[PDB]
């Protein structure tokens, strides 16, 4: 009976981009520098997959194409860290980062010379997802909210419509909570905890972005970044500084 009557959540479940494979030359290395280059390459594909996904989100493309760009350039690292976190959580009993089914960074590689400082932040979101026992539906909504978690200081060119969409998904997340088990007092606490998690993503994004920017501009290191991703980065580094970025927060805490 139901299934044949689409729900916002059931639709979020089907547009979820499928799992990408790394390509390989699987004898996977020890050089911290190769790992990064390799991950940057896969990252480029991973981001394109995400853009397509954004366009499939109900109401997203009904925004000025300019806002669709600002959004994706402000939240890509976020969508990336959150999805990697979830995939790492559902993948194993613990300890690792699962970038692809054919590309995994385990305890060993995770601690090579310059890896841990970069990876610890990625492990963080994975541990958080585990700690709060987040359901697949909760995650589908939270990830959508992450796309809508940073607007320009000076608003958007579709502000009104944006505000309406953001709220639609916030309520959509509320439902996924009501569904996961069935309490009443916990629903409040639960919503407080997940909105807290969403709020902490800005922080992990901030840490991951420093390494991303530092590494991209060095040229004393010479770490490769794919073409499109490179563009988004060169494009955002100037703005991310000046404070032209506004982070929506559920808690001024």
């Amino acid at each position: 009976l139901p299934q044949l009557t689409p729900t916002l959540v059931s639709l979020l479940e089907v547009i979820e981009p499928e799992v990408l494979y790394a390509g390989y030359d699987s004898s996977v290395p020890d050089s911290t520098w190769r790992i990064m280059t390799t991950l940057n390459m896969l990252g480029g594909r991973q981001v394109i997959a995400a853009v397509k996904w954004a366009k499939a989100i109900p109401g997203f493309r009904n925004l000025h194409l300019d806002d669709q760009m600002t959004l994706l350039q402000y939240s890509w690292m976020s969508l990336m860290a959150f999805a990697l976190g979830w995939r790492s959580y559902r993948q194993s009993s613990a300890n690792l980062l699962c970038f692809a089914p054919d590309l995994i960074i385990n305890e060993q590689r995770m601690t090579l010379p310059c890896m841990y400082d970069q990876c610890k932040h990625m492990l963080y979101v994975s541990s958080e997802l585990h700690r709060l026992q987040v359901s697949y539906e909760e995650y589908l909504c939270m990830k959508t909210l992450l796309l809508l978690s940073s607007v320009p200081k000076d608003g958007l060119k579709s502000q009104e419509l944006f505000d309406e969409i953001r709220m639609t998904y916030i309520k959509e997340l509320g439902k996924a909570i009501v569904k996961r088990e069935g309490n009443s007092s916990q629903n409040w606490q639960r919503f407080y905890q997940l909105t807290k998690l969403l709020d902490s993503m800005h922080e992990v994004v901030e840490n991951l972005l420093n390494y991303c920017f530092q590494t991209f501009l060095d040229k004393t290191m010479s770490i490769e970044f794919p073409e499109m991703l490179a563009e988004i980065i060169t494009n955002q580094i100037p703005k991310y500084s000046n404070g032209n970025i506004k982070k929506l927060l559920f808690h001024q805490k």
Binding site: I48, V51, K55, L65, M69, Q73, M228, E231
Partner: peptide, 11 residues
């Protein structure tokens, strides 16, 4: 022009 991202948002 092209702007890889912009171009995909219209692909």
């Amino acid at each position: 022009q092209k702007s890889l991202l912009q171009q995909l948002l219209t692909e």
